[PDB]
Scaffold this active site. Structure first.
Site, mmCIF file in Angstrom:
data_model
loop_
_atom_site.group_PDB
_atom_site.id
_atom_site.type_symbol
_atom_site.label_atom_id
_atom_site.label_comp_id
_atom_site.label_asym_id
_atom_site.label_seq_id
_atom_site.Cartn_x
_atom_site.Cartn_y
_atom_site.Cartn_z
ATOM 1 N N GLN A 42 0.821 -1.205 0.000
ATOM 2 C CA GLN A 42 0.000 0.000 0.000
ATOM 3 C C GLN A 42 0.856 1.257 0.000
ATOM 4 O O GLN A 42 0.543 2.217 -0.714
ATOM 5 C CB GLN A 42 -0.937 -0.003 1.205
ATOM 6 C CG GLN A 42 -1.927 -1.145 1.224
ATOM 7 C CD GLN A 42 -2.888 -1.090 0.064
ATOM 8 O OE1 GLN A 42 -3.313 -0.017 -0.357
ATOM 9 N NE2 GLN A 42 -3.244 -2.254 -0.458
ATOM 10 N N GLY A 81 1.730 -7.323 11.561
ATOM 11 C CA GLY A 81 1.327 -8.227 10.513
ATOM 12 C C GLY A 81 2.183 -9.480 10.502
ATOM 13 O O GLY A 81 3.236 -9.572 11.134
ATOM 14 N N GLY A 82 1.701 -10.473 9.767
ATOM 15 C CA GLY A 82 2.394 -11.741 9.714
ATOM 16 C C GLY A 82 3.663 -11.670 8.901
ATOM 17 O O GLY A 82 4.752 -11.941 9.413
ATOM 18 N N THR A 83 3.535 -11.299 7.632
ATOM 19 C CA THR A 83 4.696 -11.099 6.780
ATOM 20 C C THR A 83 5.537 -9.910 7.201
ATOM 21 O O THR A 83 6.758 -9.931 7.015
ATOM 22 C CB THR A 83 4.258 -10.894 5.337
ATOM 23 O OG1 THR A 83 3.351 -9.794 5.293
ATOM 24 C CG2 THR A 83 3.568 -12.120 4.822
ATOM 25 N N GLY A 84 4.914 -8.883 7.779
ATOM 26 C CA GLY A 84 5.663 -7.721 8.218
ATOM 27 C C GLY A 84 6.587 -8.005 9.382
ATOM 28 O O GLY A 84 7.535 -7.254 9.621
ATOM 29 N N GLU A 124 -1.031 -8.103 17.705
ATOM 30 C CA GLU A 124 -0.024 -7.143 17.262
ATOM 31 C C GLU A 124 1.097 -6.819 18.260
ATOM 32 O O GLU A 124 2.231 -6.613 17.791
ATOM 33 C CB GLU A 124 -0.766 -5.872 16.816
ATOM 34 C CG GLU A 124 0.071 -4.757 16.253
ATOM 35 C CD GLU A 124 -0.781 -3.681 15.625
ATOM 36 O OE1 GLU A 124 -2.022 -3.808 15.687
ATOM 37 O OE2 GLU A 124 -0.221 -2.721 15.058
ATOM 38 N N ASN A 133 -0.373 7.466 3.478
ATOM 39 C CA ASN A 133 0.923 6.981 3.046
ATOM 40 C C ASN A 133 1.639 7.948 2.117
ATOM 41 O O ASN A 133 2.858 7.833 1.957
ATOM 42 C CB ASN A 133 0.744 5.621 2.377
ATOM 43 C CG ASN A 133 0.256 4.565 3.351
ATOM 44 O OD1 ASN A 133 0.726 4.488 4.484
ATOM 45 N ND2 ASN A 133 -0.706 3.763 2.923
ATOM 46 N N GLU A 165 26.193 8.405 4.417
ATOM 47 C CA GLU A 165 26.435 9.544 5.292
ATOM 48 C C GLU A 165 25.440 9.617 6.438
ATOM 49 O O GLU A 165 25.787 10.129 7.507
ATOM 50 C CB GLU A 165 26.401 10.849 4.493
ATOM 51 C CG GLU A 165 27.506 10.956 3.461
ATOM 52 C CD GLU A 165 27.565 12.303 2.761
ATOM 53 O OE1 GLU A 165 26.674 13.144 2.987
ATOM 54 O OE2 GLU A 165 28.522 12.525 1.987
HETATM 55 N N1 LIG Z 1 0.361 3.386 7.544
HETATM 56 C C1 LIG Z 1 -0.139 2.250 7.030
HETATM 57 N N2 LIG Z 1 -0.338 1.229 7.875
HETATM 58 C C2 LIG Z 1 -0.828 0.068 7.430
HETATM 59 C C3 LIG Z 1 -1.143 -0.081 6.023
HETATM 60 N N3 LIG Z 1 -1.610 -1.317 5.861
HETATM 61 C C4 LIG Z 1 -1.596 -1.910 7.064
HETATM 62 N N4 LIG Z 1 -1.137 -1.075 7.991
HETATM 63 C C5 LIG Z 1 -0.942 -1.374 9.409
HETATM 64 O O1 LIG Z 1 -0.166 -2.555 9.472
HETATM 65 C C6 LIG Z 1 -0.663 -3.408 10.482
HETATM 66 C C7 LIG Z 1 -1.188 -4.679 9.838
HETATM 67 O O2 LIG Z 1 -0.161 -5.301 9.091
HETATM 68 P P1 LIG Z 1 -0.290 -5.568 7.536
HETATM 69 O O3 LIG Z 1 0.884 -4.986 6.854
HETATM 70 O O4 LIG Z 1 -1.651 -5.224 7.096
HETATM 71 O O5 LIG Z 1 -0.098 -7.155 7.558
HETATM 72 P P2 LIG Z 1 0.744 -8.033 6.536
HETATM 73 O O6 LIG Z 1 2.160 -7.617 6.613
HETATM 74 O O7 LIG Z 1 0.118 -8.049 5.208
HETATM 75 O O8 LIG Z 1 0.685 -9.501 7.184
HETATM 76 P P3 LIG Z 1 -0.470 -10.617 7.056
HETATM 77 O O9 LIG Z 1 -1.630 -9.966 6.424
HETATM 78 O O10 LIG Z 1 -0.651 -10.919 8.457
HETATM 79 O O11 LIG Z 1 0.136 -11.708 6.265
HETATM 80 C C8 LIG Z 1 -1.742 -2.629 11.209
HETATM 81 O O12 LIG Z 1 -1.138 -1.983 12.327
HETATM 82 C C9 LIG Z 1 -2.219 -1.643 10.170
HETATM 83 O O13 LIG Z 1 -2.780 -0.435 10.660
HETATM 84 C C10 LIG Z 1 -0.896 1.080 5.160
HETATM 85 O O14 LIG Z 1 -1.139 1.024 3.958
HETATM 86 N N5 LIG Z 1 -0.407 2.178 5.723
#
Ligand SMILES: Nc1nc2c(ncn2[C@@H]2O[C@H](COP(=O)(O)OP(=O)(O)OP(=O)(O)O)[C@@H](O)[C@H]2O)c(=O)[nH]1
Ligand SMILES: CC(=O)O[C@H]1C(=O)[C@@]2(C)[C@H]([C@H](OC(=O)c3ccccc3)[C@]3(O)C[C@H](OC(=O)[C@H](O)[C@@H](NC(=O)c4ccccc4)c4ccccc4)C(C)=C1C3(C)C)[C@]1(OC(C)=O)CO[C@@H]1C[C@@H]2O
Ligand SMILES: CC(=O)O[C@H]1C(=O)[C@@]2(C)[C@H]([C@H](OC(=O)c3ccccc3)[C@]3(O)C[C@H](OC(=O)[C@H](O)[C@@H](NC(=O)c4ccccc4)c4ccccc4)C(C)=C1C3(C)C)[C@]1(OC(C)=O)CO[C@@H]1C[C@@H]2O
Ligand SMILES: Nc1ncnc2c1ncn2[C@@H]1O[C@H](COP(=O)(O)OP(=O)(O)NP(=O)(O)O)[C@@H](O)[C@H]1O
Ligand SMILES: Nc1nc2c(ncn2[C@@H]2O[C@H](COP(=O)(O)OP(=O)(O)O)[C@@H](O)[C@H]2O)c(=O)[nH]1
Ligand SMILES: Nc1nc2c(ncn2[C@@H]2O[C@H](COP(=O)(O)OP(=O)(O)O)[C@@H](O)[C@H]2O)c(=O)[nH]1
Ligand SMILES: [Mg+2]
Ligand SMILES: [Mg+2]
Lengths: 368, 429, 441, 429
Positions: free
Chosen positions: C15, C143-146, C183, C228, C254
């Site tokens: 996103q 998030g999971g992947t995050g 989370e 974003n 730097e």
């Molecule tokens: N600022 C911002 N935060 C985001 C966005 N999408 C998700 N989040 C935040 O990210 C967190 C959720 O993680 P995501 O990135 O949606 O999860 P993911 O990495 O896709 O992992 P899974 O769906 O669990 O496989 C929450 O705290 C959301 O508010 C975005 O586009 N912008």
């Protein structure tokens, strides 16, 4: 060969500034009805040849400390004292095998006193735990004279031969099970599933079991052989034989033919775990299996974190083995214990530490 | 993508799906014949989650209709959508359970389950990867009580790590439509605690209050009662079908909404709900829907949520929204009602935002809560249970089918532990 | 020419990724088909920069983009939207299952059989590049992947690429509003490896950028499209030194020597000057000393935290457009004058000036408009310690009650890994006490 | 090219061909008169395999109709295709076997076989080179049991190295349509083990289950039962008539599908099979056909293949396909069901791809398996055999025709060795 020797220079400084109260297997090991003990395996000759560094202190009888090297925000070395108040802190050097006897003595009473005296063996791969309960105690070829079970399976006939206990018209009986695949398979039939339910007195009621009598301290070992002769489960050349079966070694005490139970043991074998992500599943089969274990083991401490607290509520139903052992958690005259086994590796410190995180939920208390 | 197998048990369950499968096809724009005639292509992006393709542009719902014990069958065939099911999936038998559990699970199920479990594995290997096993049935009755729980013992055995939801219509504490209704509750839930990932505990009396007090309806028919339940089902698998800015897997729910592996008994909720012509005197916003969702008279559970404690809730939102308003309204509820919740859990609410509303609406939502207020319901059934068993009331219709006395004592103490271990957490600890 | 490698890990990163590359192609005159018809008219400049782009023989320009999320639902908006024919079609969808917001499914169970598709795809793209490797990872916590897939990504790239630049921009969860209940578990299990491998760890928050949309932007209804774009302006206010002719161009390396005192404390807490609306472009001058003083206010932060409960260690003022350097140093001693914003003893110097003389441009279709100058302060503080007290106390709350643990222990992880991640953050947040306490004599 | 002689024995066998020869002529587009009116010319490319030319553009099927013992004869002449056979090939006699083996093989066969074997050598030397001797008959009866096996002893003697297939309709283990049915099985198979290259062991009860459970038919007539068998025959000689990207000789089957020179008893299979109007809710692909072929209720053998072990299977595919999908579906079956097969054989499956489907279909297939699950069938007959012989039941209709007691003991121990040496290989060794 030559790791950082200053690693060891960090260790010895804490040693020569304190008292140290070691612990050996030549003393009356008193009773509490509950404990979690410790016993490590000796440093191998190979590890010395590779210059493996000490990682342990044994400062006390009921406490142990780990020597973890660390680094600060200027790459300056730091050492941690993992102060772990426990109950029994035995050394790897003091293995005279009376640890089992000192662990058996309170338990050998209970079933003969009319109670449920259970145990478990917990430890890391290569930590010497097959050398700790399955026997025999030589460390060379497993010489069939020191079966560690026989050190109290002797008591099964010898403490039975106690004239105080000769008055009791009791029978020899026991049962081996298989808690695996979320199911209960018999190690006597020994390919068939059984089901187990409760009583109006909230007992447990196995359905279709073989109850075996023996007048032989080896006849029971045969049923451990014939019991292991199932040779299950998940066998391969990995962990190590990987024939991982949570092997129940349960005892059935009662009169000759009265069908009225006067106590119990249940001494259980840990499964064959997988070292983090070093393994591979490559199949929905194995992806089930370790998950079932790692939950089924975790839930065990929880009702013990309820019972060892002690508390009142007790969820015995997430695991069938606690539905097997909901019985044991209820009797006032019902002992329990469990054992830690450790390896002296420095890479093992990452896992011999995760070992100890599991037993800490008694909320032990270091006063230092 | 992941796909979902859909199973129906009981006379109740397929009647739920008979309206429900009309909703999904109208959600995409699909005829009674399977000819797609939707408006956009965005609904085509996840046809596969329920519908697989056929020869000439036709879509077939993967619905295995176990419960067509023959009286119920022809009605489904002579319905609005009798011309949409693949007729080989009509798996059934003769001379049914008769509102007996043992005639569903012990005697006639053994003469049917081999004809069922094979048809499961048919649609299974036609999927790329599975998660979805949506069993639609009721408690209390026959086929939904004994034949329903039989598959859940078996399909868990063939599929150990798949998501298992059963949207089981629970008994009612006052309106008893069945004489043996506590005897089918205690036995079937004893299966459900063991082998379910989640369940949507639904009462009809809660459906009675919603259709009358809120929707202001004169004569609610069972098509209109279940249409409320059909709104729950499509709302949950919205994000597994439609692209959303905060997505919602079934497993994303089934890791968030469950603390402990046994306590997975959910109550649903839905909004908007109104009675009008075409002029209704309100305005759809985020705090408009929010207050409606958390109402004690807007539960499908028939309990007061203020009596128990919410363990956790799930706000699955659809339509175009704004995240800050979504965030702060979920924030403000946890602030103003903090004494209601489980206090020793950091956040008590999660959100889920799809980007596409349903056809008629402009915004919508779906509440899923898990509370210690459902501790009332099993208490309102196990007391009805334990009065029958002490007098040993209906045993000769059960012991004469292959059951045992020790089975009943084993059955309730499972259920007695849930109400016991909901008291541990409704207490302020 | 130096370059950067973009990895938008997970759904939050994608996103964000929908707007970052959107912003770049608007800066460099590039349509969504990779062409540059605008500099066909001009006929000069390599403006499709090797910083972020390559060039095929037809003139079509291709990003350094790659992104993984383990679920096809998000990426299909790219492959059907306006940016379908822009990227190379090896956009790694490959998820047979979403990670379901746990760290274990994740680094341990399903990150296997996908990572080898990733790292190979990296090294194919890495060999198109000549010189400075800058990893720009875009993940969130929670998030999971995050969290799960990110932790696998670091220890595999740290081996395969040595000591190059890793700029990872972690969306840090709010101390007040969390959209997920598990989370707090993901936001500590990644910290065992985020602390070790990763070079620089940005943090932002939603609850900070929510307030700014209503205060500085004056909008009651924020959406992630409009959230974003501000983080997109943070990156373009960084990489313009690697792109544009500036009075003091500042390389990514730097940053590293400067903003990172001690090898683990890299959390430099970006800000901006987003007071545009654009009626408030009028009634307002926005000189150098105007937009400098926006860095004072705790209501202008991108992390929900008061800077006034700790110290600063380093700052990094990065200016865009019509900027005069004498005006900078005027606006510096004033910041040195105020005794409320306070420094440590051991850094008497403080700041670092970076000046491009190209301003950022307008994202059309909302919201802000053409400002003559901008600023991106990058400044780690000791005040960021108490944000972790606002997370560990959340973490230690649902630990004693043994919650959510079976979907971590039964998925390739031991429960001992949790107290590893706890004593990491116990040791790390302890180290921020060691910083501000200065050794007096 | 190679050409095929086609022989019919028994009342059963020519009734099979009477539908079957209509199928082949419709496969090419040939009238009742022999005037070719097919669509393309690709069906003309191998007319010679069955049909030789006549004077004015006429094609004559090389079918030697031994079994027209006169009651069966006129029906074949007064059929749809009575005006297509060369009438001199109607070789027959009077006062037939009467469901007696010795009246088929010892007494009346000697008064007919010299009139038969000459007509064999007539159509033989009208061929360029031979391989094909398709005998179509049944076990259990008369002419197909004694007069059928008589030619197979003789034509093997004049043609030692030619492919010998007999598509013999086996007895049924439950529906016994013949009182002397085990006495005709044991004797005739004792010829078949000695002098056949392959055989298609077919039951009617398997044909009963397929027409009713799968094809959903009310009243299956014997024209409709055998039309299932006629689908097997044309599928196998598809590649010897049509150009295929992986061809299939009879001998290409008869080197692949047989490990050991005695064990050549095959079970056939066919797909697609469905019941519909013109709307059927499915879609024809390679994994569509594949799962249908390997089904235990889609066997023409009346046995559970999961009870035995597959020695080897043969997937003869028709229509336009893709080899990777063909390869991997045959791969995936051997993976997911590896415990079923003979494990100590490297590959357990072969493929064969023709390029032309039949007329109505778009794709099709033909399963040919050889299993240790046919070990059941001879066990289900030799037990029926050995109960009759101990009481010496029907001997005076056999000893009074030229037989002996020592012949029967010799007959079964042949069959007793097959079930013995199927137990060697169904065992995991
Ligand atoms: N600022 C911002 N935060 C985001 C966005 N999408 C998700 N989040 C935040 O990210 C967190 C959720 O993680 P995501 O990135 O949606 O999860 P993911 O990495 O896709 O992992 P899974 O769906 O669990 O496989 C929450 O705290 C959301 O508010 C975005 O586009 N912008
Ligand atoms: C003029 C106008 O706006 O009419 C609305 C309407 O008046 C109301 C009252 C509708 C109406 O719903 C009902 O009266 C109702 C009847 C039986 C069971 C449940 C509800 C409506 O019938 C329902 C209809 O719902 C839909 O169109 C949704 O897409 C819905 N569809 C179906 O349930 C459906 C019905 C028949 C055939 C196929 C589908 C849906 C909801 C969730 C998931 C998928 C689909 C809507 C908005 C309306 C009417 C038409 C009056 C309401 O219901 C829904 C589901 O939207 C009842 O409370 C809401 C609020 C709506 O404003
Ligand atoms: C509208 C449509 O598609 O109709 C199909 C049809 O509905 C089905 C059910 C057909 C139909 O077959 C039967 O019902 C049937 C009857 C007696 C014995 C066996 C089958 C069909 O009759 C049979 C017919 O088969 C052929 O045309 C083949 O070429 C087939 N021909 C003959 O058997 C044949 C019949 C009469 C006269 C001459 C030839 C064939 C197969 C293998 C080798 C050579 C030829 C087909 C596809 C159909 C109908 C017409 C309904 C099916 O059979 C075949 C052989 O294709 C039965 O299951 C399949 C699936 C088909 O879809
Ligand atoms: N307490 C001990 N004292 C002396 N030697 C020991 C002790 N424990 C183990 N050993 C020796 O250490 C070696 C390994 O012990 P063993 O019990 O085989 O390990 P393990 O834990 O069973 N390993 P594995 O089966 O591979 O998972 C053997 O040679 C033992 O005899
Ligand atoms: N919501 C709903 N409940 C139903 C329906 N039909 C029956 N029930 C309920 O289901 C239970 C009776 O079981 P039923 O499904 O009819 O019996 P079965 O056919 O033996 O499974 C009772 O609690 C009824 O109130 C229905 O269409 N909708
Ligand atoms: N499939 C099939 N079987 C037949 C047919 N006619 C007879 N049978 C079977 O053939 C056997 C009887 O032999 P039959 O051919 O009639 O005797 P014959 O004329 O002496 O050879 C029995 O097993 C019958 O079930 C037929 O048209 N089709
Ligand atoms: Mg070992
Ligand atoms: Mg995601």
């Amino acid at each position: 060969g030559n790791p950082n020797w200053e690693t060891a220079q960090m260790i010895r400084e804490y040693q020569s500034t304190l008292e140290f109260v070691p612990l050996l297997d030549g003393q009356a090991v008193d009773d509490h009805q509950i404990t979690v003990c410790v016993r490590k395996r000796p440093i191998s000759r190979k590890e010395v040849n590779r210059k493996e560094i000490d990682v342990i202190s044994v400062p006390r009888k009921d406490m142990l400390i780990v020597h973890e090297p660390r680094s600060k925000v200027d790459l300056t070395k730091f050492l941690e004292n993992h102060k772990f108040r426990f109950d029994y802190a035995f050394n790897d050097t003091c293995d005279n095998a009376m640890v089992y006897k000192y662990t058996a003595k309170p338990l050998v009473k209970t079933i003969f006193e009319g109670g449920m005296a259970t145990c478990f063996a917990y430890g890391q791969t290569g930590s010497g735990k097959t050398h700790t309960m399955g026997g025999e105690f030589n460390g060379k070829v497993q010489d069939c004279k020191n079966g560690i079970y026989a050190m109290a399976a002797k008591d099964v006939f010898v403490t039975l031969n106690m004239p105080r206990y000769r008055a009791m018209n009791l029978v020899v009986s026991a049962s081996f099970f298989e808690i695996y695949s979320g199911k209960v398979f018999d190690l006597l039939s020994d390919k068939q599933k059984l089901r187990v339910l409760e009583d109006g007195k909230q007992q447990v009621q196995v359905v279709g079991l073989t109850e075996k009598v023996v007048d032989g301290v080896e006849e029971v070992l045969k049923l451990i052989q014939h019991g292991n002769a199932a040779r299950t489960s998940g066998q391969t050349s990995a962990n190590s034989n990987s024939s991982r079966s949570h092997a129940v070694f349960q005892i059935v005490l009662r009169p000759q033919g009265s069908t009225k139970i006067h106590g119990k043991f249940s001494f259980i074998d840990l499964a064959g775990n997988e070292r983090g992500v070093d393994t591979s599943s490559a199949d929905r089969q194995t992806r089930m299996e370790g998950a079932e274990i790692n939950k089924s083991l975790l839930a065990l401490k929880e009702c013990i974190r309820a019972l060892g607290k002690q508390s009142a509520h007790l969820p015995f139903r997430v695991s069938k083995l606690t539905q097997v052992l909901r019985d044991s958690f209820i009797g006032e005259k019902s002992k329990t214990c469990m054992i830690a086994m450790i390896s002296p590796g420095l890479s093992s410190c990452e896992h011999t530490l995760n070992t100890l995180r599991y037993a800490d939920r008694v909320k032990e208390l270091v006063v230092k | 993508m992941r796909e979902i197998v859909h199973i129906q048990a009981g006379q109740c369950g397929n009647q739920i799906g008979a309206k429900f499968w009309e909703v999904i096809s109208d959600e995409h724009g699909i005829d009674p014949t399977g000819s797609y005639h939707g408006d956009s292509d965005l609904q085509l992006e996840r046809i596969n989650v329920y519908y697989n393709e056929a020869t000439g542009n036709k879509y077939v719902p993967r619905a295995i209709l176990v419960d067509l014990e023959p009286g119920t069958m022809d009605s489904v065939r002579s319905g609005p959508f009798g011309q949409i099911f693949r007729p080989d999936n009509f798996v059934f038998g003769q001379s049914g359970a008769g509102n007996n559990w043992a005639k569903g699970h012990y005697t006639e199920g053994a003469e049917l389950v081999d004809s069922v479990l094979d048809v499961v594995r048919k649609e299974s290997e036609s999927c790329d990867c599975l998660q979805g096993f949506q069993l639609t049935h009721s408690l209390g009755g026959g086929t939904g009580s004994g034949m329903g729980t039989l598959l859940i013992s078996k399909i868990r055995e063939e599929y150990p790590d798949r998501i298992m939801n059963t949207f089981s219509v629970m008994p009612s504490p006052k309106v008893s439509d069945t004489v043996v209704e506590p005897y089918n509750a205690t036995l079937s839930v004893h299966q459900l605690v063991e082998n379910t990932d989640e369940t949507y505990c639904i009462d009809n009396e809660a459906l009675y209050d919603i259709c009358f007090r809120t929707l202001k309806l004169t004569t609610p028919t069972y098509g209109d009662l279940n249409h409320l339940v059909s709104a729950t089902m499509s709302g949950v698998t919205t994000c597994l079908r439609f692209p959303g800015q905060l997505n919602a897997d079934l497993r994303k729910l089934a890791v968030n909404m469950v603390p402990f592996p046994r306590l997975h008994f959910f109550m649903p909720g839905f909004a908007p709900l109104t009675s009008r012509g075409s002029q209704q005197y309100r305005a759809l916003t985020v705090p408009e829907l929010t207050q409606q969702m958390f109402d004690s008279k807007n539960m499908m559970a028939a309990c007061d949520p203020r009596h128990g404690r919410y363990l956790t809730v799930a706000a699955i939102f659809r339509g175009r929204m704004s995240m800050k308003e979504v965030d702060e309204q979920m924030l403000n509820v946890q602030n103003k009602n903090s004494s209601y919740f489980v206090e020793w859990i950091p956040n008590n609410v999660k959100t889920a935002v799809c980007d596409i509303p349903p056809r008629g609406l402009k915004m919508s939502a779906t509440f899923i809560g898990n509370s210690t207020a459902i501790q009332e319901l099993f208490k309102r059934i196990s007391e009805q249970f334990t009065a029958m068993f002490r007098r040993k009331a209906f045993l000769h219709w059960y012991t004469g089918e292959g059951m045992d006395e020790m089975e009943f004592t084993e059955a309730e103490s499972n259920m007695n532990d849930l109400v016991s271990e909901y008291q541990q957490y409704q207490d302020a600890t | 020419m130096r370059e950067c490698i973009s990895i938008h890990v997970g759904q939050a990163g994608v996103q964000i990724g929908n707007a970052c590359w959107e912003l770049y192609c608007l800066e460099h005159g590039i349509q969504p088909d990779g062409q540059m018809p605008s500099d066909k008219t001009i006929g000069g400049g390599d403006d499709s920069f090797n910083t972020f782009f390559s060039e095929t023989g037809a003139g079509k320009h291709v990003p350094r983009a790659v992104f993984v999320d383990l679920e096809p639902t998000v990426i299909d908006e790219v492959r059907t939207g306006t940016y379908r024919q822009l990227f190379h079609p090896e956009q790694l969808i490959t998820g047979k299952e979403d990670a379901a917001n746990n760290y274990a499914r994740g680094h341990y169970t399903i990150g296997k059989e996908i990572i080898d598709l990733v790292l190979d795809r990296i090294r194919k793209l890495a060999d198109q590049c000549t010189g400075l490797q800058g990893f720009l990872v875009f993940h969130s916590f929670g998030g999971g992947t995050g969290s799960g897939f990110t932790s696998l990504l670091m220890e595999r790239l740290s081996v395969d690429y040595g000591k190059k630049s890793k700029l990872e921009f972690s969306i840090y969860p709010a101390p007040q509003v969390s959209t997920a209940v598990v989370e707090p578990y993901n936001s500590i299990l990644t910290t065992h490896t985020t602390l070790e491998h990763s070079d620089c760890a940005f943090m932002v928050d939603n609850e900070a950028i929510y307030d700014i949309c209503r205060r500085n932007l004056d909008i009651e209804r924020p959406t992630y499209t409009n959230l974003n774009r501000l983080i997109s302006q943070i990156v373009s206010s960084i990489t313009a030194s690697l792109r544009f002719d500036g009075a003091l161009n500042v390389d990514l390396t730097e940053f590293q020597t400067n903003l990172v005192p001690y090898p683990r404390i890299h959390f430099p807490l970006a800000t901006y000057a987003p007071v545009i609306s654009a009626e408030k472009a009028y009634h307002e001058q926005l000189s150098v000393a105007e937009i400098t003083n926006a860095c004072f206010e705790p209501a202008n932060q991108m992390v929900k935290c008061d800077p006034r409960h700790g110290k600063y260690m380093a700052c990094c003022l990065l200016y865009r457009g019509d900027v005069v350097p004498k005006d900078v140093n005027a606006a510096i001693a004033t910041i040195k004058t105020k005794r409320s914003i306070q420094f440590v003893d051991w850094c008497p110097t403080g700041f670092k000036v970076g000046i491009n003389y190209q301003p950022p441009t307008v994202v059309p279709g909302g919201d802000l408009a053409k400002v003559q100058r901008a600023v991106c302060m990058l400044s780690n503080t000791t005040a960021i310690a108490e944000a972790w007290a606002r997370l560990d106390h959340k973490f230690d709350l649902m630990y004693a009650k043994r919650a959510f643990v079976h979907w971590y222990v039964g998925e390739g992880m031991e429960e001992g890994e949790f107290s590893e991640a706890r004593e990491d953050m116990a040791a790390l947040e302890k180290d921020y006490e060691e910083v501000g306490v200065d050794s007096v004599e």
